[PDB]
Ligand binder design. Sequence first.
Ligand SMILES: Cc1oc2ncn(CCCN(C)C)c(=N)c2c1C
Length: 330
Amino acid sequence: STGSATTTPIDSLDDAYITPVQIGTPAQTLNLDFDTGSSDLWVFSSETTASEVDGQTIYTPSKSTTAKLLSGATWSISYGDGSSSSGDVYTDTVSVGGLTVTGQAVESAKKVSSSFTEDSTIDGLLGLAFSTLNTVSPTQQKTFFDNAKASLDSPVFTADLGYHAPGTYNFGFIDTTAYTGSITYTAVSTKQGFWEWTSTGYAVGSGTFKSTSIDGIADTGTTLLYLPATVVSAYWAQVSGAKSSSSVGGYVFPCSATLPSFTFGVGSARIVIPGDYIDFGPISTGSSSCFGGIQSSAGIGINIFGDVALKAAFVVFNGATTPTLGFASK
Ligand SMILES: Cc1oc2ncn(CCCN(C)C)c(=N)c2c1C
């Protein structure tokens, strides 16, 4: 089997991406944030504290003839950005782009933190990291991809995120028309539960490439690119007036700037992030200070190849017995 679903930016700045997902019988379609940095499929629901729901579409398990309460199971997750959610668990039929998994754990939120409530465009998350990170207790549950894997034509999924435009998540096949040149594959460590790999270096604009190992994770659920302070300083030094602002919470730059590109290495291959991808717009409405899309990972504890990086590539998440990651230009 295969599946193919369109993923769409939530706003004009690509602050996150949503993909429609069918849950239950009859189908209830929710727009979920596909997140290769976590491993829980959780949704706003009829059980979510009413004051914490503001415009999201909810899953109502009592209206699904295939929903079953997973007795005694609870979940609770805290994300790197400080957000969180928790609740109980159903199993139900979940379909993405024509690919159906029966008996998928659907984690129903009883509580969500303010940033979730405040984002009316995202009805939940669909985790695509390794199932070892799944938070369901006392019996850990599998991700949608892990459940689908055996049925897929090939044990892979691909992320093809757009810049200020829709893109695609495919399951079970590699669309050879969706990228240019060749896909370069690189080793993955699953030791921390992530799609963790090592970039071979970087360049800023038309500058020379610096060969240096940068360990990080391919994370579709993180918006920005988080790299070591040395790398990030080298990038922003090429932008007149750019500065790190403690009060704003990262590098900002004059909105009048034309940003340089940023290149990262995948083995001997190179992925180029155009400068415009690194502009996240005014820090507040009407401001002439703009927020940068490349930020320091110092104090995160890990480097994160988030959407800013991934959207410049066609990315293969190869879930074979020894997982690997592939990157192509597009
Ligand atoms: C205006 C805005 O800026 C954002 N940045 C990251 N995200 C992603 C947050 C992911 N986290 C909850 C685990 C957003 N959802 C978002 C919105 C909305």
